[PDB]
Amino acid sequence: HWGYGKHNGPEHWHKDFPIAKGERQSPVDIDTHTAKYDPSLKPLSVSYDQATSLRILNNGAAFNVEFDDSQDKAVLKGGPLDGTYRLIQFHFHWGSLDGQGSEHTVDKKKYAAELHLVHWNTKYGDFGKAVQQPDGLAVLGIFLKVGSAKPGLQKVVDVLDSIKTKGKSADFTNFDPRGLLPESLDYWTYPGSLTTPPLLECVTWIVLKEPISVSSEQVLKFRKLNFNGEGEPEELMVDNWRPAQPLKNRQIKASFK
Ligand SMILES: [Zn+2]
Numbered sequence: 001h002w003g004y005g006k007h008n009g010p011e012h013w014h015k016d017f018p019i020a021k022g023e024r025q026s027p028v029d030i031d032t033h034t035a036k037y038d039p040s041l042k043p044l045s046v047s048y049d050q051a052t053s054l055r056i057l058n059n060g061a062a063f064n065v066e067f068d069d070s071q072d073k074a075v076l077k078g079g080p081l082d083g084t085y086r087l088i089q090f091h092f093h094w095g096s097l098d099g100q101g102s103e104h105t106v107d108k109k110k111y112a113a114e115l116h117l118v119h120w121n122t123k124y125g126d127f128g129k130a131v132q133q134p135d136g137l138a139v140l141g142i143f144l145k146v147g148s149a150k151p152g153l154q155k156v157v158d159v160l161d162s163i164k165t166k167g168k169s170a171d172f173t174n175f176d177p178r179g180l181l182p183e184s185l186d187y188w189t190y191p192g193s194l195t196t197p198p199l200l201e202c203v204t205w206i207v208l209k210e211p212i213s214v215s216s217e218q219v220l221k222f223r224k225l226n227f228n229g230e231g232e233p234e235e236l237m238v239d240n241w242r243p244a245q246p247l248k249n250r251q252i253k254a255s256f257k
Pocket of ligand 1: 091195
């Protein structure tokens with residue numbers, strides 16, 4: 001099955017998921033000088049004060065921190081969005097080295113990692129219905145660079161030992177995702193897709209201009225995770241990123257000048 005190895009990586013995904021060669025695939029390179037400032041874009045509204053985190057799961061592709069999305073407790077609104085989008089989970093993509101790991105790139109620059117806060121449009125009732133709609137999901141993407149530690153990430157880093165292998169989970173209550181945001185919510189936005197199979201073209205991407213800084217030790221700990229299940233040969237969970245895909249007939253809009 002699909003993965004991030006030589007034999008099942010992104011270049012192979014189209015054989016099982018032909019939408020991999022679709023018209024609105026993600027990620028993309030954000031060419032900052034081709035993007036256009038759109039003064040009609042509103043400030044993002046990130047309302048996470050009442051967020052209820054539940055669990056952290058190694059799903060074999062990344063680790064997901066999952067939230068209670070049965071009510072409007074942690075929501076994204078505004079920006080390019082029409083309506084209310086509920087946070088369901090966040091996860092990261094990262095590299096084997098600090099110079100790669102992000103899915104989106106900025107003028108071809110790759111960051112060490114990229115955080116995805118995944119939200120679904122409440123008018124569609126459930127996430128499964130939402131992924132079948134062109135405006136079903138809103139994903140807030142945040143780049144990670146290596147420098148000073150991110151204090152609000154350390155609770156995540158410290159629990160990874162307990163979910164080393166695929167299928168493992170652990171309680172992860174009372175986590176505040178506001179601690180993973182940069183200072184500025186300036187962003188780029190474009191229509192795209194899930195970046196893992198089934199690669200559905202259901203996402204409004206909102207990628208923050210300002211990276212967060214994490215320490216070398218924090219991202220090092222991501223790299224100790226395993227793609228494999230317990231009892232199987234150890235395959236480090238590194239380079240779990242899809243490379244940039246062609247922009248095709250899309251425009252990237254900037255919320256800032
Ligand atoms: Zn992702």
